[PDB]
Design a protein around this ligand. Structure first.
Ligand SMILES: Nc1ccn([C@@H]2O[C@H](COP(=O)(O)CP(=O)(O)OP(=O)(O)O)[C@@H](O)[C@H]2O)c(=O)n1
Ligand SMILES: [Mg+2]
Ligand SMILES: [Mg+2]
Lengths: 717, 51
RNA sequence: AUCUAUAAUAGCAGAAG
RNA sequence: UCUGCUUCUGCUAU
RNA sequence: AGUAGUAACAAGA
């Protein structure tokens, strides 16, 4: 017998065993070299889908920009970026007509959002392009560098702390004759065009650890001048998506499954009995490369009708900046000579003035096709969205096309509705016969073509209503469990012993709750997690023979302890977990069983493995000694000048927390400097203390004198 | 070392199916070196955690 | 009965597009 | 010159 | 050589 696992589908429906088809036990594919190839190929595809558009030269950056809007209607079924503005405006108008007041209410909530949001929001980002260094940096570091450069250039509206004031600072920065960068101290001066190109740049990197793809692709990260505007636009689009029944966003998880099930259920209820009902499991092809920023500007302009003009402007800036964006090419390439046995790095900035003899066929073609767009090591990319930068606005566009499917708009016997999550979509078509179904599908496809949406024909299929797939959720008369997708969440997390126990047990319990993890498999998952935990942390049961550096101390503690069942697993104790007590932490689970001296040692108030805060008297520690801190190795470049800046930053922040007790519980607000706030707090505290009677004459005088000394030092350095 | 001692029947190693793109004498010498260093740190019976 | 929300600390990890 | 955006979920508290 | 797969590793300073 030849074993064929796929033959199991001959009896078990594919949905009820979909977990088999997800091979998430092996490592995911990574990229190894540069991402310049994928970046250039993305730019060339974007300009190929819009090649019949109009070419112009940007008077501000000098970049060739392609405009495919209102271009010739497509003649074939290849992806097209030729969205018609009148069709997009009609889709918006009919979405507002079908849901009266959606855009007005969304604009009110977004006005509140825009007026209250702080600049600190921008620090909630991951790796960000930093134009001051022309490199990727943490979002908070990039924002701090931007604020420092803006301040040294006389731009200080961001001192208000509001995001919109920082956006005004960005707007004013885009009008300066020259930008001063002060490194460490080399004083560089960018001119208007160079600073402008750096401000409209999105750094490009290759996406790593991605399942389901044979070939790698490029992702983009914008700078700080783009992120605030994109945040405001995405907030407006999220407010809109929240009010739409077809939107699969921003709902996620169990709430998303419930919404999808209820909406599909209502759709099947609305469909009359004599009607034929079909469902398209549909993907859209080249979604981000055919989403035009000009159509996003049209959508925002229609959505913000009759709003204050400042609001329309601040919402219009993101599509404008994305219409004039530049894509940084990346790291370049690497060249090898076998005969000379040497290798060298060729930067991307010299890919326009390099000889094409060095490259293979396809890379030479890429460079030849992309050379007219190269400026300062970036490529002009007017069309496209550059990989999920306006997820919610493109969701709104897709939902508008879905909304165009009611019988009041089709004016025929067929109609359609469905679900839209950015690019993914489930389309339910109803019609009195099969010809009507075909006509409705053709009309939906062509209407999508009219707005720059291209249904992937090779990835989409259609069947009688009742089963479909939407955003990796498989629906067979109801959504099925897919446990494999949550498989990489099982294991030792690497935080510390306590946190790893908590995470392992909690993951097992939540997988029992959400992903149909059965009780026997849950017990076996518990056993496997305890094995992996004991291996990782060298904390095998005291009464064992495994030889490790920790085993002697564990044997001593084991033989020392009367009640062994109270010892934590990290202390070589037994595993008392079962299905009953997964929701209970480990220290609480066996608190009754602990020996008194072991319990008073594990939870000692003067625990030396956790940090202690001053009130040299300190607060008592509560955590156990298993909550230690892992050494983080961060030691070979020239970027070692920031280690001292960060150390002094930390010193200042600890002093501030000594003056402001709630600063680390909630984010502090204030336009005053740190010294001013701290001195005023010290003064008012000394006053209400001398008054209430905790300090005397002389201590109050001394505090007031030190405050006056600090204030004359801040005025007189 | 103990599991190897359970086997009697060692011969002089010779190449039976060569690696057509490699240098096979290097593989023969690598196996001989593994045997020699095992005999070395066994003759010592001061067997470290790593050799 | 409602409850992302008559709501907003932050970081990390998993998944999805 | 190298883990982006968005959404959800879980854990933790420099 | 090998890993690997559209570009890299097979140390670097
Ligand atoms: N990591 C990710 C994955 C997806 N996305 C967003 O989801 C879209 C569809 O991805 P997708 O992966 O479905 C496109 P694929 O099906 O591979 O190819 P095709 O375009 O030829 O059809 C992208 O264009 C981005 O907007 C993202 O922002 N980050
Ligand atoms: Mg789909
Ligand atoms: Mg896809």
């Amino acid at each position: 017998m030849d074993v064929n696992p796929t033959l199991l589908f001959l009896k078990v429906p594919v949905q009820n065993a979909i977990s088999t088809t997800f091979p998430y036990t092996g490592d995911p594919p990574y990229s190894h070299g540069t991402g310049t190839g994928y970046t250039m190929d993305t730019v060339n595809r974007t300009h190929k889908y819009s090649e019949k558009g109009k070419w112009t030269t940007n008077t501000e950056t000098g970049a060739p920009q392609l405009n495919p809007i209102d271009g010739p209607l497509p003649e074939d079924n290849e992806p097209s970026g030729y969205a018609q503005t009148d069709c997009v405006l009609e889709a918006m108008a009919f979405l507002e007509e079908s849901h009266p007041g959606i855009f007005e209410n969304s604009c009110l909530e977004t006005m509140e959002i825009v007026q209250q949001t702080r600049v600190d929001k921008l620090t909630q980002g991951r790796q960000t392009y930093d134009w001051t260094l022309n490199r990727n940096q943490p979002a908070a570091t990039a924002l701090a560098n931007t604020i420092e450069v803006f301040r040294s250039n006389g731009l200080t509206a961001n001192e208000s702390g509001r995001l919109i004031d920082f956006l005004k600072d960005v707007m004013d920065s885009m009008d300066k004759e020259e930008m001063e960068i002060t490194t460490h101290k080399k004083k560089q001066r960018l001119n208007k065009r160079s600073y402008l190109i750096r401000a409209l740049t999105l750094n490009t990197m290759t996406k790593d650890a991605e399942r389901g793809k044979l070939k790698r692709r490029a992702i983009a990260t914008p700078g700080m001048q783009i992120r605030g505007f994109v945040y405001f636009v995405e907030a407006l689009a999220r407010s809109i998506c929240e009010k739409l029944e077809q939107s699969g966003l921003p709902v996620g998880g169990n709430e998303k499954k419930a919404k999808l099930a209820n909406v599909v259920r209502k759709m099947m209820t609305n469909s009359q009995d004599t009607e034929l009902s079909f469902t398209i499991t549909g993907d859209n092809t080249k979604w981000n490369e055919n989403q035009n920023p000009r159509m996003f500007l049209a959508m925002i302009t229609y959505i913000t009708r009759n709003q204050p003009e400042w609001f329309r402007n601040v919402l219009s800036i993101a599509p404008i900046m994305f219409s004039n964006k530049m894509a940084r090419l990346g790291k370049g390439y690497m060249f090898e000579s076998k005969s000379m046995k040497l290798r060298t790095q060729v930067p991307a900035e010299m890919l326009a003035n390099i000889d094409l003899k060095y490259f293979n066929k396809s890379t030479r073609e890429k460079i030849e096709k992309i050379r007219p767009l190269l400026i300062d090591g970036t490529a002009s990319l007017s069309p496209g969205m550059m990989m999920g930068m306006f997820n919610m606005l493109s969701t709104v566009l897709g939902v508008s096309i879905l909304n165009l499917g009611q019988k009041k708009y089709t004016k025929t016997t067929y109609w359609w509705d469905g679900l839209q999550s950015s690019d993914d979509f489930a389309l339910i078509v109803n019609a009195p016969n099969h010809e009507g179904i075909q006509a409705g599908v053709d009309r939906f496809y062509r209407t999508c073509k009219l707005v720059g949406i291209n249904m992937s024909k090779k990835k989409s299929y259609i069947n009688r209503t009742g089963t479909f797939e939407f955003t990796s959720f498989f629906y067979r008369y109801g959504f099925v469990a897919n446990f494999s997708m949550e498989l990489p969440s099982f294991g030792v997390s690497g935080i510390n012993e306590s946190a790893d126990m908590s995470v392992g047990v909690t993951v097992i319990k939540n997988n029992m709750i959400n992903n149909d993890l059965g009780p026997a498999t849950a017990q076996m998952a518990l056993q496997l997690f305890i094995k992996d935990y004991r291996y990782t942390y060298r904390c095998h049961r005291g009464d064992t023979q495994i030889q490790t550096r920790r085993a002697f101390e564990l044997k001593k503690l084991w033989e020392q302890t009367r009640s062994k069942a109270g010892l934590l697993v990290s202390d070589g104790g037994p595993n008392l977990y079962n299905i009953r007590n997964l929701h209970i932490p480990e220290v609480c689970l066996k608190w009754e069983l602990m020996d008194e001296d072991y319990q008073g040692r594990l939870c000692n108030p003067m625990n030396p493995f956790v940090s202690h805060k001053e009130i040299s008297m300190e607060y008592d520690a509560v955590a156990t000694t298993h909550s230690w801190i892992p050494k983080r190795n961060r030691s070979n470049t020239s970027q070692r000048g920031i280690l001292e800046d960060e150390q002094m930053y930390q010193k200042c922040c600890n002093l501030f927390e000594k003056f402001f007790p709630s600063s680390s519980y909630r984010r502090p607000v204030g336009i005053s400097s740190m010294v001013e706030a701290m001195v005023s707090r010290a003064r008012i505290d000394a006053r209400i203390d001398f008054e209430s009677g905790r300090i005397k004459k002389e201590e109050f005088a001394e505090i007031m004198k030190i405050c006056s000394t600090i204030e004359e030092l801040r005025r007189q350095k | 070392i103990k599991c190897m001692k359970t086997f009697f029947g060692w011969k002089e190693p010779n190449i039976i199916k060569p690696h057509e793109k490699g240098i096979n004498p290097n593989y023969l010498l690598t196996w001989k070196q593994v045997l020699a260093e095992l005999q070395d740190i066994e003759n010592e019976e001061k067997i470290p955690r790593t050799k």
